[PDB]
Amino acid sequence: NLFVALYDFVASGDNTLSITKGEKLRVLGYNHNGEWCEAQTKNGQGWVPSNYITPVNS
């Protein structure tokens, strides 16, 4: 469904994606240990920290 970024995260290469606090996104998957998640926003796709996002509308 839809998630929202809790904090700002700036992309650092290695297929990561920058996300802004309050920005909505779709979660497409997770890495082996669940620490990183594949996100899709209006800016594209890339990995973002899993603990930086939460479901839109708690």
Binding site: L6, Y7, D8, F9, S12, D14, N15, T16, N31, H32, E35, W36, E38, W47, V48, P49, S50, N51, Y52
Partner: peptide, 10 residues
């Protein structure tokens, strides 16, 4: 996915 650790919450 990155092999390094995601930064902790600010």
């Amino acid at each position: 996915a990155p092999s390094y650790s995601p930064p902790p919450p600010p």
